Design an enzyme around this catalytic site. Structure first.
Site, PDB file in Angstrom:
ATOM      1  N   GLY A 153      19.381 -56.416  54.589  1.00  0.00           N
ATOM      2  CA  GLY A 153      20.662 -55.729  54.192  1.00  0.00           C
ATOM      3  C   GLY A 153      22.133 -56.273  53.363  1.00  0.00           C
TER       4      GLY A 153
ATOM      5  N   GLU B 134      18.359 -52.230  48.493  1.00  0.00           N
ATOM      6  CA  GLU B 134      18.903 -52.075  46.851  1.00  0.00           C
ATOM      7  C   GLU B 134      18.155 -53.306  46.111  1.00  0.00           C
ATOM      8  OE1 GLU B 134      21.355 -51.850  49.803  1.00  0.00           O
ATOM      9  OE2 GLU B 134      22.602 -53.396  48.705  1.00  0.00           O
TER      10      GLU B 134
ATOM     11  N   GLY C 165      23.238 -48.952  56.775  1.00  0.00           N
ATOM     12  CA  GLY C 165      21.392 -48.216  56.736  1.00  0.00           C
ATOM     13  C   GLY C 165      20.232 -49.203  56.815  1.00  0.00           C
TER      14      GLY C 165
ATOM     15  N   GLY D 174      20.544 -52.453  57.108  1.00  0.00           N
ATOM     16  CA  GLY D 174      21.172 -53.351  57.911  1.00  0.00           C
ATOM     17  C   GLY D 174      20.502 -53.303  59.489  1.00  0.00           C
TER      18      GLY D 174
ATOM     19  N   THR E  53      32.917 -50.288  55.279  1.00  0.00           N
ATOM     20  CA  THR E  53      32.558 -49.238  54.022  1.00  0.00           C
ATOM     21  C   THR E  53      31.699 -47.638  54.163  1.00  0.00           C
ATOM     22  OG1 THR E  53      30.412 -51.423  53.929  1.00  0.00           O
ATOM     23  CG2 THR E  53      31.834 -50.837  52.053  1.00  0.00           C
TER      24      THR E  53
ATOM     25  N   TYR F 228      34.355 -61.340  52.174  1.00  0.00           N
ATOM     26  CA  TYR F 228      32.642 -61.805  52.380  1.00  0.00           C
ATOM     27  C   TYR F 228      32.313 -63.530  51.885  1.00  0.00           C
ATOM     28  CZ  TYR F 228      32.083 -56.474  54.024  1.00  0.00           C
ATOM     29  OH  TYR F 228      31.951 -55.619  53.101  1.00  0.00           O
TER      30      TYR F 228
ATOM     31  N   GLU G 220      15.111 -72.569  75.641  1.00  0.00           N
ATOM     32  CA  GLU G 220      15.726 -73.458  76.127  1.00  0.00           C
ATOM     33  C   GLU G 220      17.439 -73.074  75.933  1.00  0.00           C
ATOM     34  OE1 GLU G 220      16.114 -77.365  75.955  1.00  0.00           O
ATOM     35  OE2 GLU G 220      16.586 -77.155  77.733  1.00  0.00           O
TER      36      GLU G 220
HETATM   37  N1  LIG Z   1      30.142 -60.893  57.636  1.00  0.00           N
HETATM   38  C1  LIG Z   1      30.021 -60.473  56.348  1.00  0.00           C
HETATM   39  N2  LIG Z   1      29.952 -58.300  56.752  1.00  0.00           N
HETATM   40  C2  LIG Z   1      29.665 -57.767  55.153  1.00  0.00           C
HETATM   41  C3  LIG Z   1      28.640 -58.368  54.284  1.00  0.00           C
HETATM   42  N3  LIG Z   1      28.364 -57.955  53.720  1.00  0.00           N
HETATM   43  C4  LIG Z   1      28.574 -56.978  54.439  1.00  0.00           C
HETATM   44  N4  LIG Z   1      29.169 -56.839  55.049  1.00  0.00           N
HETATM   45  C5  LIG Z   1      29.297 -55.484  56.608  1.00  0.00           C
HETATM   46  O1  LIG Z   1      28.495 -55.065  56.688  1.00  0.00           O
HETATM   47  C6  LIG Z   1      28.697 -53.392  57.070  1.00  0.00           C
HETATM   48  C7  LIG Z   1      27.769 -52.656  55.955  1.00  0.00           C
HETATM   49  O2  LIG Z   1      26.520 -52.380  55.467  1.00  0.00           O
HETATM   50  P1  LIG Z   1      25.692 -53.382  54.481  1.00  0.00           P
HETATM   51  O3  LIG Z   1      25.282 -54.704  55.292  1.00  0.00           O
HETATM   52  O4  LIG Z   1      26.631 -53.320  53.211  1.00  0.00           O
HETATM   53  O5  LIG Z   1      24.858 -52.880  53.773  1.00  0.00           O
HETATM   54  P2  LIG Z   1      23.084 -52.208  54.048  1.00  0.00           P
HETATM   55  O6  LIG Z   1      22.271 -53.245  54.696  1.00  0.00           O
HETATM   56  O7  LIG Z   1      22.567 -53.206  52.657  1.00  0.00           O
HETATM   57  O8  LIG Z   1      22.349 -50.861  53.996  1.00  0.00           O
HETATM   58  P3  LIG Z   1      22.645 -49.778  52.056  1.00  0.00           P
HETATM   59  O9  LIG Z   1      23.801 -50.529  50.979  1.00  0.00           O
HETATM   60  O10 LIG Z   1      23.061 -48.146  53.191  1.00  0.00           O
HETATM   61  O11 LIG Z   1      21.401 -49.543  52.539  1.00  0.00           O
HETATM   62  C8  LIG Z   1      29.672 -53.443  56.762  1.00  0.00           C
HETATM   63  O12 LIG Z   1      30.733 -53.681  58.788  1.00  0.00           O
HETATM   64  C9  LIG Z   1      30.479 -54.778  56.415  1.00  0.00           C
HETATM   65  O13 LIG Z   1      32.034 -54.757  56.566  1.00  0.00           O
HETATM   66  C10 LIG Z   1      28.756 -59.982  54.209  1.00  0.00           C
HETATM   67  O14 LIG Z   1      28.669 -60.656  53.164  1.00  0.00           O
HETATM   68  N5  LIG Z   1      29.730 -59.898  55.035  1.00  0.00           N
HETATM   69 MG   LIG Z   2      24.286 -52.100  50.586  1.00  0.00          MG
END
Ligand SMILES: Nc1nc2c(ncn2[C@@H]2O[C@H](COP(=O)(O)OP(=O)(O)OP(=O)(O)O)[C@@H](O)[C@H]2O)c(=O)[nH]1
Ligand SMILES: [Mg+2]
Ligand SMILES: Nc1nc2c(ncn2[C@@H]2O[C@H](COP(=O)(O)OP(=O)(O)O)[C@@H](O)[C@H]2O)c(=O)[nH]1
Lengths: 431, 431, 48
Positions: free
Chosen positions: A10, A63, A136, A138, A171, A216, A246
């Site tokens: 993700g 995506e 979704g 992630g 988001t 980010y 360990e």
């Molecule tokens: N630390 C950090 N958090 C991130 C980043 N991108 C997204 N997030 C966090 O992750 C969550 C959003 O999920 P995403 O990872 O953007 O979404 P995805 O996994 O691509 O899933 P879909 O877009 O729904 O298919 C939120 O809590 C964001 O704050 C990043 O580069 N760094």
């Molecule tokens: Mg995404």
């Protein structure tokens, strides 16, 4: 020899992966094309016939947007195209779409690529999985992949770097649902998981690095530093090291209680020049300050079960022991009655490396503390309460049901979380 | 998730739709020939969401123009941007609906529907990844209302998994003379409750009141009302057509905005309020833009947001401004106006900022609210409907088309249930 | 692991059982809210 495969799932996972691999290259002197003018770095980078060093990693997203940036970016030559996997349709912040609907189409392809990387390994240790709890992909795709990895890899070690959601950078309204669904499903498949609370990171960037509105890019650079501290012991051969096994042996007393709290120090702004050099005592004291934590919680209200201190740079054992002794005189650090030996210390020779043009100052010495505290249950409670608020009214549930999920899966996930909270409570009680 | 297929139905639908295309073409730097002449790479980044790229440098709207009457279509072709539209995409009848929902839905409309689906299928099969559909129409007429809802039902049959979005213009005694508008609206609302994923409730009562009371236009024309519609449509679609984090696609927007299936009627808001050509030489700061979210004077639906509670809110800020200031101002509004936000949907206000302001303004704010106050708009329609239905007035126009009285009773009851559902969640507590 | 593989291939088949059957309903509505159309185009040529 002792290889580790990194999987980035993700947007969060991929973007953190970009930060990690950029840092590893700086640390090992690898150029963005894989060229380099120890030998332990081979656990993370394979070598080709042309003398190029390739990350032992897979980047996955449903995506293409995020990964398209990697394949156009500075490090486009670092990775082979087949290890950068993208779908067409995202999971639309829906765990059910990531796990079932959309995930089921790409799962077999992702595992085929992982298998090809594993075939290049002579002594594969296991996997490092980077993902967000909130998205979704992630959430949904990670739990699907974790389940499949347990089947194909027998009892091969799986460690997570999980992005705990924060409202300052959130988001989706449905992030508590996705978080609980992924935690329930992945719990039996993960060996050790390091949560990173985005609010804690947002606050460190604001407080310590004087960044008004952290992006980010700012968050990930800081995250990468903690991941590098945890993985330095695998990628380098120091005086004091700790392998995949360990880490788990020292920090994980029970199967389910596998969530250590990370604390990093020092985090200094690239301005000033006078705010250094910090001593071993100063950086060790900073590990016990809740302001330097990677997850927001209060250890003073919990009990410790294990404390690992990972030092890096100009550090001497005599300096460390002196620092630990003064900290022991501060009565306030309570351990569980069944745990005696509290401090496991590791020293890795290389000082922390920083990204040129980054927000972090170059320091002679740094430290990462991994502590298994019952105070981490506070992070689960916050998430569980947000889930309950919405679930009591079945708000947004129809989005998951429509994708083929059943309401019973929600009850099951929440009951498992209640059991996890109960486990942290039971563990802190004395006999 | 990439392409959106746009459909324009009826007099109102084509009028508002044509203005939407001249507004967004100007924002994306597209001239009436389809050639990009802008000077910002942001304009082209997500150009594919609304435009198909034809051979060479040309961009063509993925728009289907529908009417049972030919005249409106001729007016569109004759227009400023009339030449931009795909010739083959104009699907017009000769027979008219005569402001009768029954003619549009069952008789004349049914005869033309297949010719329209043939054009929508052509556009849909060309798509790499179709997000879904966007329909602009009135609810007071016969083609826009009756045929429009018939198209929704036929499209839903062939594309049941795509997102269905509408921009539905609600009738008002203040602006129109078909006496049967309460019947056409109620019969359409019954269809939208069941068939769309998201509906932007664009109220002519509110647009007339803004023009007359705020813009001091003694006798508003549809051109005056449509300038407010096009400003709103540009605002609510910003997230879909420019690179962004929040609500970047139709599904993510729906997942974040719709807690219960039927409660998918949005109350749009816009600041600052402008008249055709009215500069915008000095006006509107961040605190000023934020304050107009609760301002009933700025609502595109004739409802007072302070007469209800917000289930979910999406706020889009446009122009060159401080992200820190936006975040502070937005948090202040939620803290000060605590009582107008539901406690059982955590972090329910999501904000996005886009660097590109709409035409003529250097700074703007668009609000999309899912408020329980939208029941005021449905109540108004139900009382106007019942005043006529009680006396079975004009029923001959519908029964003469083959309709039965029961359909009228059912549509009304379904709409009253929707009102009752909004009232239920307005009164619900986080107990 | 033996029993693991199945738990998953069950999950993805009680889901795929549902996901299919919520588009079963999606269409049956969509066919009836069409059956009515003829039953109403009926009353139009029948109008005498
Ligand atoms: N630390 C950090 N958090 C991130 C980043 N991108 C997204 N997030 C966090 O992750 C969550 C959003 O999920 P995403 O990872 O953007 O979404 P995805 O996994 O691509 O899933 P879909 O877009 O729904 O298919 C939120 O809590 C964001 O704050 C990043 O580069 N760094
Ligand atoms: Mg995404
Ligand atoms: N805002 C706006 N409302 C319109 C416009 N044209 C018609 N209407 C409204 O739409 C309703 C009449 O429907 P109309 O679109 O003319 O009929 P149709 O061609 O059979 O759909 C009434 O509520 C009118 O006030 C227009 O250009 N703008």
């Amino acid at each position: 020899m002792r290889e580790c495969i990194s999987i980035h799932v993700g947007q969060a996972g991929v973007q953190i992966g970009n930060a990690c691999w950029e840092l590893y290259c700086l640390e090992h002197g690898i150029q963005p094309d894989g060229q380099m003018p120890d030998d332990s770095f081979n656990t993370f980078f394979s070598e080709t016939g042309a003398g190029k060093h390739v990350p032992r990693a897979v980047f996955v997203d449903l995506e293409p947007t995020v990964i398209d940036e990697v394949r156009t970016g500075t490090y486009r030559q670092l990775f082979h195209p087949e290890q950068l996997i993208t779908g067409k349709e995202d999971a639309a912040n829906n765990y059910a779409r990531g796990h079932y609907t959309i995930g089921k189409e790409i799962i077999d392809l992702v595992l085929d690529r992982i298998r090809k990387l594993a075939d290049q390994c002579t002594g594969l240790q296991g996997f490092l999985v980077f993902h967000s709890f909130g998205g979704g992909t992630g959430s949904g795709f990670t739990s699907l992949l974790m389940e499949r990895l347990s089947v194909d890899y027998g009892k091969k070690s799986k460690l997570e770097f999980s992005i705990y959601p924060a409202p300052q950078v959130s988001t989706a309204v449905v992030e508590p649902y996705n978080s609980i669904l992924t935690t329930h499903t992945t719990l039996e498949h993960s060996d050790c998981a390091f949560m990173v609370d985005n609010e804690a990171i947002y606050d460190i960037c604001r407080r310590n690095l004087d960044i008004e509105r952290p992006t980010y890019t700012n968050l990930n650079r800081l995250i990468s530093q903690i991941v590098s501290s945890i993985t330095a012991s695998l990628r380098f051969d120091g005086a004091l090291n700790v392998d995949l096994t360990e880490f788990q042996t020292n920090l994980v007393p029970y199967p389910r209680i596998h969530f250590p709290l990370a604390t990093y120090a020092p985090v200094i702004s690239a301005e000033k020049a006078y705010h250094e050099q910090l001593s071993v005592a100063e950086i060790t004291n900073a590990c016990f300050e809740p302001a330097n934590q990677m997850v927001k919680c209060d250890p003073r209200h919990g009990k410790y079960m294990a404390c690992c201190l990972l030092y890096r740079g100009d550090v001497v054992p005599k300096d460390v022991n002196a620092a630990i002794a003064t900290i022991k005189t501060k009565r306030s650090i309570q351990f569980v009655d069944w745990c005696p030996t509290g401090f496991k210390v590791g020293i890795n020779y290389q000082p922390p490396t920083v990204v040129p043009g980054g927000d972090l100052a170059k320091v002679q010495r740094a430290v990462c503390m991994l502590s298994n505290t019952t105070a981490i249950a506070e992070a689960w409670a916050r998430l569980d309460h947000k889930f309950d608020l919405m679930y009591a009214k079945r708000a947004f549930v129809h989005w998951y049901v429509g994708e083929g999920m059943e309401e019973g899966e929600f009850s099951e996930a929440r009951e498992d979380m209640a059991a996890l909270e109960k486990d942290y409570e039971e563990v802190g009680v004395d006999s | 998730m990439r392409e959106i297929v746009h459909i324009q139905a009826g007099q109102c639908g084509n009028q508002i739709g044509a203005k939407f295309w001249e507004v967004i073409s100007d924002e994306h730097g597209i001239d009436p020939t389809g050639s990009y002449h802008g000077d910002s790479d942001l304009q082209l980044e997500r150009i594919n969401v609304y435009y198909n790229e034809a051979t060479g440098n040309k961009y063509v709207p993925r728009a289907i123009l529908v009417d049972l009457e030919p005249g409106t279509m001729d007016s569109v072709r004759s227009g400023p941007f009339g030449q931009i539209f795909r010739p083959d995409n104009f699907v017009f009848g000769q027979s008219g609906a005569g402001n009768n929902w029954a003619k549009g839905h069952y008789t004349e409309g049914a005869e033309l529907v297949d010719s329209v689906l043939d054009v929508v299928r052509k556009e849909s099969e060309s798509c790499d990844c179709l997000q879904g559909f966007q329909l602009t129409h009135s609810l007071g007429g016969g083609t826009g209302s009756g045929m429009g809802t018939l198209l929704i039902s036929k499209i839903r049959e062939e594309y049941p998994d795509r997102i269905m979005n509408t921009f539905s213009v609600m009738p008002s005694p203040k602006v129109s003379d078909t006496v049967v508008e309460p019947y056409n609206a109620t019969l359409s609302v019954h269809q939208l409750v069941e068939n769309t994923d998201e509906t932007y409730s664009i109220d002519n009562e509110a647009l007339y009141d803004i023009c007359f009371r705020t813009l001091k236009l003694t006798t508003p024309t549809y051109g005056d009302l449509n300038h407010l519609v096009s400003a709103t449509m540009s605002g609510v679609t910003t997230c879909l057509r420019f690179p962004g984090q929040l609500n970047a696609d139709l599904r993510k927007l729906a997942v974040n905005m719709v807690p219960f299936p039927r409660l998918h009627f949005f109350m749009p808001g816009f600041a600052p309020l402008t008249s055709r050509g009215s500069q915008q030489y000095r006006a509107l700061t961040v605190p000023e833009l934020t304050q107009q979210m609760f301002d009933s004077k700025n609502m595109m639906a004739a409802c007072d947001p302070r007469h209800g509670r917000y289930l979910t809110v999406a706020a889009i800020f446009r122009g060159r401004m401080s992200m820190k200031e936006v975040d502070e101002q937005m948090l202040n509004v939620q803290n000060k106006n605590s009582s107008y936000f539901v406690e059982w949907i955590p972090n329910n206000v999501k904000t996005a900022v886009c660097d590109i302001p709409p035409r003529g303004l250097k700074m703007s704010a668009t609000f999309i609210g899912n408020s329980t106050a939208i029941q005021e708009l449905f109540k108004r329609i139900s009382e106007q409907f019942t005043a006529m239905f009680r006396r079975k007035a004009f029923l001959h126009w519908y029964t003469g088309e083959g309709m039965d009285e029961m359909e009228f009773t059912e549509a009304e009851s379904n709409m009253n249930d929707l009102v009752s559902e909004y009232q239920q969640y307005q009164d619900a507590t986080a107990d | 692991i033996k029993m693991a593989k199945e738990k998953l291939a069950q999950k993805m088949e009680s889901n795929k059982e549902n996901r299919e059957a919520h588009f079963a309903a999606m269409l049956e509505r969509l066919q009836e809210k069409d059956k009515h159309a003829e039953e109403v185009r009926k009353n139009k040529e029948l109008k005498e």
